[PDB]
Amino acid sequence: DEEEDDEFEEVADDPIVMVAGRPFSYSEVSQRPELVAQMTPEEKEAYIAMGQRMFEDLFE
């Protein structure tokens, strides 16, 4: 009758963000807005780009 192929999971390692030309954690960046200001223009995009990638499949 019904399919039992429905499973819910949420496990994954946090991605790495480049701040001022150095490796950093996306979570650490949000905690420190000053880091974003230190990030170059192109580096700033990589910060925002990652966000969209994670929000590619999130419908409520």
Give a summary of the structure in a few sentences:
By secondary structure, the protein is an alpha+beta fold. It contains 3 helices and 2 strands, in the order ββααα. It is classed as transcription.
Word description of this protein:
The chain has 60 residues and is α+β, with helices and mostly antiparallel strands. The chain has one domain: Helix Hairpins. The chain has helices spanning 26-31, 33-38, 41-54; strands at residues 16-19, 22-25. Strands 1-2 form a two-stranded antiparallel ribbon. The radius of gyration is 16 Å and the shape is elongated.
Itemize the secondary structure elements and their pairings.
Blueprint lengths: L15 E4 L2 E4 H6 L1 H6 L2 H14 L6
Antiparallel strand pairs: 1-2
PDB class: transcription
Keywords: tfiie, tfiih, activation domains, p53, Transcription, Transcription regulation
Assembly: monomeric
Tally of DSSP β-strands: 2
Radius of gyration: 16 Å
Overall CATH architecture: Helix non-globular
Structural class: alpha+beta
CATH topology: Helix Hairpins
What is the string of SSEs from the N terminus onward?
EEHHH
* CATH level-1 class: Special
Oligomer: monomer
Number of helices, counting only DSSP H or I runs of 4 residues or more? 3
Q: Whole-Å distance between the termini?
A: 26 Å
Per the principal axes of the C-alpha atoms, what is the gross shape?
A: elongated
